[PDB]
Design a binder for these strands. Structure first.
Lengths: 83, 217, 129, 101, 71, 221, 132, 25
RNA sequence: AGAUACCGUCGUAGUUCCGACCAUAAACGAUGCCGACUGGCGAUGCGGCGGCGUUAUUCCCAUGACCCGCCGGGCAGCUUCCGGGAAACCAAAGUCUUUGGGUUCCGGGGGGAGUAUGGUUGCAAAGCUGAAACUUAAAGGAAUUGACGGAAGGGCACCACC
């Protein structure tokens, strides 16, 4: 958050679910910080950085955590768009 | 996994999927699992689309190799079909296996000597192992599960549409992931196949345990 | 029966947001609805919406972001002066920083701050934050 | 406190059903409420079923069964120990007891 | 409120005008019955003549003889 | 005297690997050792016993009484907690509730009323929490207004760092158990309420459990 | 009412999982091993404990008992845990594939192979169990 | 005291009052 | 103990029909109606549409009877962290301090009391309308732990019996 002087004043900025864009609360112990590894195409080994996501506990408890992860993989090209 | 011709399912794998019967799903259907099924044939048995099973199989493998320390990824199974597959998965990769009788509280109770704090939990069956999935909600724990057309998707963070009924099938994807998880990090060459045989992961009936002995005696 | 048409539209897109749908369908489309959605779209609270204009009261498919807390409707459409408009947004809006009261004036349909600039009040339609 | 969801009776869309009389008492109970028991028994069980066999002029003569449909009221069905009270969550289960002998 | 019509004022106002009488405090203040039954008659105090000194008993385990007068 | 960690999170805070308490909140990691908090906020953080509630159960020999202690805790800046513990001894319940109170401290989001000058003084929005039947509301207020509320939640709000706020309570507020939990639920919703300010895309930082994954195989189990 | 308490059962399992070779089968000798491999304060416990380990032997030669760690038979398990047949249960050229599956394969590029034998679809939908 | 017998007892009393009052008209 | 009660034997009005009255029931889903939206799942009833096969007329198409689906609305059920609720529980009792879809009826501590009185309806029984004086610090709801039960299921004791 800002003030008129133009200063970040909150102590920390919370995460936001990569699927529902809802702020993941500080006590949402059912949230996840999954890290999907990308792979260099020619040799097919592990490159070293990630394609991290974040799912709120609510949709996990609802049942769309795997469908959301699948749609996020398609948006980043990890899962073949043919699928 | 995405249009990278190195990671497309090759012809030897599909012959393993057809022989083991992983494409053949359950009789009924979960509304969450309609994303991975081809069509319900007559005799009332769904067909799991293997091409969409292969894509999830690699996607699950991306998460594991992303985890630095290969120990803090728990591999569990309570049904008799999966124990033999998960101890040799965790021995091939370096994970910590849990074979049967998941005592409730191994993720939330400190005083426990069986207190584990993994980073990722892969499961053989969401129904049979319904307990550890719940504990995966009290601690921030991504989850993988060898789901079937009937398995619910509560707290399952990525699913692998499979047939988790037959012994020949369950051991196969525990042998399938074993290859890819060791193919991402340099352990195996993708050109020549893996020396480990997929029959090694299969669950042996106590009947066939002592029926092949005299075939060897 | 369906008396208020704007009420059915807002409650539907408010229900579908709590559930987390990506895009919601509302059955009747009226001139006031599309004028209401643009006030929300010009503030970033909703996404790109589309009108499936058949030969009847058309249907609208609104792409939803995760930015909408609630988009209520005030019924009936009370008359608002510029003297009591501050008292409405005092007990209708969450805080003085964000939230908007959509109200129709002779100048058209706009939020309450544009009604401050154009210095004219009118009937109140709803609110979103 | 509402005990059963279905009010302990099968009436769901009627409004009124015809009553029946209990078998032990003569209580008037609604037909969908009464505990019905359908008994199929031979006229002879074990002591007679043998010595009646050779006493029959027709040898290998199948003995006729007795078909009776009992209608119990809630009080009689309980006192006769045909049904018994169950725990709150055991009440909800409505499959008949297992049948093997 | 139940009916939120734009011109249901006489329906809303006549309702509260009706339902107010079911409030116990309001009904005694706007009917003579409470005021006529009051020996004071709305006055805060009153003068009277004492004509005997009577002792009143207490009720619950609090047991005593309360001293009063018949004014 | 000195503390030895049990949870893998507690290992790191004893190694000064974790900078502050906020990066534990950022990943919603469950804190399960009370000595993590006193490491970050252990000096300026003050305690407060709210009420000693003597509950009772009936047995074949009289009544078995055990006391219940409501403890509100937290430094008067940004953080506040609330623990409840029931033990047979009052001294054991108070000492026990303080332990649970620290394990439940949450960050409060403090905001401005109209003009964003100076430091935040009030709640950012109209947030309300509810426990049982109690429904307590929090309204942003101008500066120098003070906490306008009952004495019970006034302490929780003073221990949260908020100095100006309007409240409105509905329900049976006589039950301090629900009337204190309710406000704590409202204060906990300040960082769950989405604001047009918090609309920028989250750049994901790497988890402290992953960013220190080599320090967890180097010295201990 | 000759039911062994846990402290008899607990101590009787510990010696078997530690001295499975020194103790025998008859009551008397493995009675004599117990005072040397475990300091028992009383004589009756010395016989109570020894009485149970004898009973557990004729449960061990008849098969495995659940809570025990006998370094001989869990290796009987381990050699059965890595057995690998000469041929795979996957290496079939006789894979009965049904007419409706291969179009899913035909929907892939692995549509026409060599060692796939099409079957016949059993006509007449009959798969549900009778209701009630 | 059943709420049904108080309704029967008060109907018997209310009926007796109608007669004692009617014999005065 | 008494039974003007339960139990038993008789038995009047009634129970039946026709024609008029009466307008009340725990008339209950103790849940106003209309409309929208918000999870699945397996059934079921009626209508319609589609589809291998089986079986009837036999001489097949078309019709029936099964079998697999889909659509509409209908009585329901199961399931769940939708969400709500004091909770029991509820896909409605949800979309409610983030409070406003439309509209009827109706409640305001417990008693006194659905009483008195007036009016009105009815042949009557009664129905509808409907107070106050006075009295009172509780009455009540859901749930918990006990104790208790001429409640049930297991087990025990010669301070119990056989």
């Amino acid at each position: 958050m800002q003030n008129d002087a133009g200063e970040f004043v909150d102590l920390y900025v919370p995460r936001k679910c990569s699927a529902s864009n809802r702020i993941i609360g500080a006590k949402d112990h059912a949230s996840i910080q999954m890290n999907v590894a990308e792979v260099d195409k020619v040799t097919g080994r592990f490159n070293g950085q990630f394609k991290t996501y974040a799912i709120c506990g609510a949709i996990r408890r609802m049942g769309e955590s795997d469908d959301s992860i699948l749609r996020l993989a398609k948006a980043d090209g990890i899962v073949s768009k043919n699928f | 996994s995405g249009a990278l011709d190195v990671l497309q399912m090759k012809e030897e794998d599909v012959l393993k999927f057809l022989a083991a019967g992983t494409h053949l799903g359950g009789t009924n259907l979960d509304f969450q699992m309609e994303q991975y099924i081809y069509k319900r044939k007559s005799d009332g048995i769904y067909i799991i689309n293997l091409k969409r099973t292969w894509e999830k199989l690699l996607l699950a493998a991306r998460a594991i190799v992303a985890i630095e320390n290969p120990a803090d990824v728990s591999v569990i199974s309570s049904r008799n079909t999966g124990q033999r597959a998960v101890l040799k998965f965790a021995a091939a990769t370096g994970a910590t296996p849990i074979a049967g009788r998941f005592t409730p509280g191994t993720f939330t109770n400190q005083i426990q000597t069986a207190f584990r704090e993994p980073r990722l939990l892969v499961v053989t069956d969401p129904r049979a192992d319904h307990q550890p999935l719940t504990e995966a909600s009290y601690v921030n724990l991504p989850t993988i599960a060898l789901c079937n057309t009937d398995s619910p998707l509560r707290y399952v963070d990525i699913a692998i549409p499979c047939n988790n009924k037959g012994a020949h099938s369950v051991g196969l994807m525990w042998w399938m992931l074993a290859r890819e998880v060791l193919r991402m990090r340099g352990t195996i060459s993708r050109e020549h196949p893996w020396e480990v045989m997929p029959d090694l992961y299969f669950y042996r009936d106590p009947e066939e345990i002592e029926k092949e002995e005299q075939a060897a005696a | 029966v369906r008396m208020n048409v704007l009420a059915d539209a807002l409650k539907s897109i408010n229900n579908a947001e709590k559930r987390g749908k990506r895009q919601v369908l509302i059955r009747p489309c009226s001139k006031v609805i599309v004028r209401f959605l643009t006030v929300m779209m010009k503030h970033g609270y909703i996404g790109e919406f589309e009108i499936i204009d058949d030969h009847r009261a058309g249907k609208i498919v609104v792409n939803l972001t995760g930015r909408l807390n609630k988009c209520g409707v005030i019924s009936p459409r009370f008359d608002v002066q510029l003297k009591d408009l501050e008292k409405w947004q005092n007990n209708l809006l969450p805080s003085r920083q964000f939230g908007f009261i959509v109200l129709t004036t002779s100048a058209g349909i706009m939020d309450h701050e544009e009604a401050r600039r154009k210095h004219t009040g009118g009937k109140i339609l709803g609110f979103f934050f | 406190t509402k005990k059963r969801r279905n009010n302990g009776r099968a009436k769901k869309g009627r409004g009124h059903v015809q009553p029946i009389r209990c078998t032990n008492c003569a209580r008037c109970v609604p037909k969908d409420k009464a505990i019905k028991k359908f008994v199929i028994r031979n006229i002879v069980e074990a002591a007679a079923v043998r010595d009646i066999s050779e006493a029959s002029v027709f040898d290998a003569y199948v003995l006729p069964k007795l078909y009776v449909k009992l209608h119990y009221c809630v009080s009689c069905a309980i006192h006769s120990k045909v049904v018994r009270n169950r725990s709150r969550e055991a009440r909800k289960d409505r499959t008949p007891p297992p049948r093997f002998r | 409120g139940k009916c939120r019509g734009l011109r249901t004022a006489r329906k809303l106002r006549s309702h509260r005008r009706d339902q107010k009488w079911h409030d116990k405090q309001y009904k005694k203040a706007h009917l003579g019955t409470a005021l006529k039954a009051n020996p004071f008659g709305g006055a805060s105090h009153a003068k009277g003549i004492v004509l005997e000194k009577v002792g009143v008993e207490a009720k619950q385990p609090n047991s005593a003889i309360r001293k009063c007068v018949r004014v | 005297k000195e503390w030895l960690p049990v949870t893998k999170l507690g290992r790191l805070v004893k190694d000064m690997k974790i900078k502050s308490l906020e990066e534990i909140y950022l990943f919603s990691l469950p804190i399960k050792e009370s000595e993590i908090i006193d490491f970050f906020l252990g000096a300026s953080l003050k305690d407060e016993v709210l009420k000693i509630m003597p509950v009772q159960k009936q047995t074949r020999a009289g009544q078995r009484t055990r006391f219940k202690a409501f403890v509100a805790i937290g430094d008067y800046n940004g953080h506040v907690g609330l623990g409840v513990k029931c033990s047979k001894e009052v001294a054991t319940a108070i000492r026990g509730a303080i332990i649970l109170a620290k394990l439940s401290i949450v960050p409060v989001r403090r905001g401005y009323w109209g003009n964003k000058i100076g430091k935040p003084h009030t709640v950012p929005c109209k947030v309300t929490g509810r426990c049982g039947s109690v429904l307590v509301r929090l309204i942003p207020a101008p500066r120098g207004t003070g906490i306008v509320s009952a004495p019970v939640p006034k302490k929780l709000l003073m221990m949260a760092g908020i100095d100006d706020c309007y409240t409105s309570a509905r329900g049976c507020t006589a039950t301090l158990g629900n009337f204190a939990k309710a406000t704590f639920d409202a204060i906990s919703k300040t960082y769950s309420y989405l604001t047009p300010d918090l609309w920028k895309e989250t750049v994901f930082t790497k988890s402290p459990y992953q960013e220190f994954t080599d320090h967890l195989v180097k010295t201990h189990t | 009412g000759r039911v062994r308490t846990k402290t008899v059962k607990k101590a009787a399992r510990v010696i078997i999982e530690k001295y499975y070779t020194r103790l025998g089968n008859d009551f008397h000798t493995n009675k004599r091993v117990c005072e040397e491999i475990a300091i028992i304060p009383s004589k009756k416990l010395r016989n109570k404990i020894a009485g149970y380990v004898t009973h557990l032997m004729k449960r061990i030669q008849r098969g495995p008992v659940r809570g025990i760690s006998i370094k001989l038979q869990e290796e009987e398990r381990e050699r059965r845990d890595n057995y690998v047949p000469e041929v795979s249960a996957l290496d079939q050229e006789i894979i009965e594939v049904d007419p409706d599956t291969k179009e899913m394969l035909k929907l892939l590029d692995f549509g026409s192979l060599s060692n796939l034998q099409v079957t016949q679809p059993t006509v007449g939908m009959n798969f549900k169990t009778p209701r009630g | 005291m059943r709420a049904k017998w108080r309704k029967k007892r008060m109907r018997r009393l209310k009926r007796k009052r109608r007669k004692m009052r009617q014999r005065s008209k």
